[PDB]
């Protein structure tokens, strides 16, 4: 009787769920009302940050002759980028290790 | 009986299959990506909630999300995220 159901993610051109982000914004005690464009904007920003980190981690995995991203590759992707290291400054990535950093006066 | 237990794993996988069509991801790195998405969601939503409360508004709009993205993300990260969010809101309103 009614039209075929299109998701709001495909209507916005996104891979991240706009309806789930809308439900988490409504049920999260942030405000009493949520605008219609707020979960679209938020899902787009989350998809952009996920794509940036996953592309840097995939390049770090390809540089180590590997076809699968492990936590070490995410740690190397985040700590080798100043803005991503500033964003995830107080964040410990489990099984990520440290950057290889020996002080120059020791050598 | 078992509960729902929602996650972001299929969306992170959909994003990874278009930035790297042959690379895969381990389940331990998928949990880290899930924690990252939840953390950035909570940060942006809390900053937008405080922005709406400072200005005596009751609605979180895309303007509050844009200002929270400009407050939280450093450098060109904020510029490109504002570009992506504005592009998605423009495409969503036209459709």
């Amino acid at each position, epitope marked *: 009787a009614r039209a075929k159901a299109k998701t709001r993610s495909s209507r916005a051109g996104l891979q991240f769920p706009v309806g789930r982000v809308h439900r988490l914004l409504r049920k999260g005690n942030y405000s009493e009302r949520v605008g219609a464009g707020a979960p679209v904007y938020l899902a787009a920003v989350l998809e952009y940050l996920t794509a*940036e980190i996953l*592309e*840097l981690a995939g390049n770090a995995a390809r540089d180590n002759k590997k076809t699968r991203i492990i936590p070490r590759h995410l740690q190397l992707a985040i700590r*080798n980028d100043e*803005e991503l290291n500033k964003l995830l400054g107080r964040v410990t990535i489990a099984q990520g290790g440290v950057l290889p950093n020996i002080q120059a006066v020791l050598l | 009986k078992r509960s729902r237990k929602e996650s972001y794993s299929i969306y992170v996988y959909k994003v990874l299959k278009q*930035v790297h069509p042959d690379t895969g991801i381990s389940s331990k790195a998928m949990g880290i990506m899930n924690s990252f998405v939840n953390d950035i969601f909570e940060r942006i939503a809390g900053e937008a909630s405080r922005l709406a409360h400072y200005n005596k508004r009751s609605t979180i709009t895309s303007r509050e999300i844009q200002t929270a993205v400009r407050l939280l993300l450093p450098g*060109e*990260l904020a510029k490109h995220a504002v*570009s992506e969010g504005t592009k998605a809101v423009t495409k969503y309103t036209s459709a």
Partner: single-chain antibody
Framework: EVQLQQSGPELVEPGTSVKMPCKAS????????IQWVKQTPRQGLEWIGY????????KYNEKFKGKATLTSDKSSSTVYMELSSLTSEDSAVYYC?????????????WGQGTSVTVSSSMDIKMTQSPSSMHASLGERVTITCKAS??????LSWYQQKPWKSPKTLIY???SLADGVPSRFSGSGSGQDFSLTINNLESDDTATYYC?????????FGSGTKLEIK
């Protein structure tokens, strides 16, 4: 504003080395890579390499590996480039360009260049389909930059007045750069890209380059000379 001051013109003899500075100011120095481009009037623009002063991490073009060496200095906010074993095929202008560490960012701001005059292959090929075009002061010019392998929208467009530094028009194959009017509009994805200019003027008389940065050696296009009648 963001400005990358570079040294003046230098005359040298072969066999020795030369080190040119790229003193940068107006921004936080460690957050951005500094790229190096060589411009001959024989092969066009070629990407040498970059240094990221946050961790002093470099990546060179294998054509220039061993020939060039980039170093940085956080105290003076300066990036140096040493050109060892100066052969006669080194007579060029060497621009230093600022690029963010973000993947969709391109070479935003350029130095004015140092004209260095010495006194005597598994890559991506960018093919600009018009090599020279002529047009009057009001019609619509379209330049295409069909790539070879695949670049997922990681293409930018530059214009260059003669004896000037290049200026960014488009990045990410569609997005307008800062301070660029809406007459310029890029389009395309995958392997086929295009730049259209809508209402020409006399300042639109320049050479128009496309640069890919989707793979590890960055490759410029051959160029397109637009002359306005």
């Amino acid at each position: 504003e963001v400005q990358l001051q570079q040294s003046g013109p230098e005359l040298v003899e072969p066999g020795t080395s030369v080190k040119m500075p790229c003193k940068a100011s107006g921004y936080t120095f460690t957050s951005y890579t500094i790229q190096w481009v060589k411009q001959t009037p024989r092969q066009g623009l070629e990407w040498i390499g970059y240094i990221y002063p946050y961790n002093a991490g470099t990546k060179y073009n294998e054509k220039f590996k061993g020939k060039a060496t980039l170093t940085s200095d956080k105290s003076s906010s300066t990036v140096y480039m040493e050109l060892s074993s100066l052969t006669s095929e080194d007579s060029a202008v060497y621009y230093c360009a600022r690029k963010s560490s973000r993947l969709r960012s391109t070479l935003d701001y350029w130095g004015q260049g140092t004209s260095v005059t010495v006194s005597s292959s598994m890559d991506i090929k960018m093919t600009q389909s018009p090599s020279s075009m002529h047009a009057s002061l009001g019609e619509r010019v379209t330049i295409t930059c069909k790539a070879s392998q695949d670049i997922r929208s990681y293409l930018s467009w530059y214009q260059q007045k003669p004896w000037k530094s290049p200026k960014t028009l488009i990045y990410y194959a569609t997005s307008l750069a800062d301070g660029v009017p809406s007459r310029f509009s890029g389009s395309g994805s995958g392997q086929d890209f295009s730049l259209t200019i809508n209402n020409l003027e006399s300042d639109d008389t320049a050479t128009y380059y496309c640069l890919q940065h989707g793979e590890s050696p960055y490759t410029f296009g051959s160029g397109t000379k637009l002359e306005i009648k």
